[PDB]
Amino acid sequence: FHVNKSGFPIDSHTWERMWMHVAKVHPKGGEMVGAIRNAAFLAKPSIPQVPNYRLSMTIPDWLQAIQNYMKTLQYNHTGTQFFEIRKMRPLSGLMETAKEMTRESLPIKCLEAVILGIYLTNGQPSIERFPISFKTYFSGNYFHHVVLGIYCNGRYGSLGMSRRAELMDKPLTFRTLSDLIFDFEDSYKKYLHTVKKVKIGLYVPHEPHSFQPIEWKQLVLNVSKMLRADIRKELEKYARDMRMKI
């Protein structure tokens, strides 16, 4: 769980640390690292075009293009996160980082994907965006994960990046926030994860104030302690509050 704080190109310390981590993690370790480092005939990966909304696109096709772009960047399995995300930084700063992601065009993980999905949907007021955070428990350890909730034309969905295909993008077909959250919980249970906490943020402003950050935890439910009827009750109340701009 290393983060690149050195910018681009990545500095020696960060670069050598990445290689040592994967050498430890991978069973062929040194042989694998030696095959890649200083290899003379590595494919230059193509650079995917950054998606941009045009009036000729349906909103679902546009969102799918955003999600496909993220998938083309790839989920970052290297162990070194390439773009530092300070979650409490103002949005203006986070959007500079998102632009840097489109310029440097490297693999990303879940938090970077949320920032990137905000950047790529900024300026389409029909799409409301809000972070959804999960704390899960699996075989004795806690895991944190976050996706970008989407609300558009009376439907909920999500954008994101995960190691698992069922914990990221969700189509605009959920009629309530509860249904969307319960679909994530059901997906998590396929991997024997118990959801401990669900955190819902506020809508992310399309035109935020200079110092406004993302709000990540406007609603926090300790769902492992609640009956599903109460979870739905609390999510639906909060979602109604969101939709009314209270």
Partner: peptide, 5 residues
Amino acid sequence: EGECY
């Protein structure tokens, strides 16, 4: 976040 999941 780190683990993402």
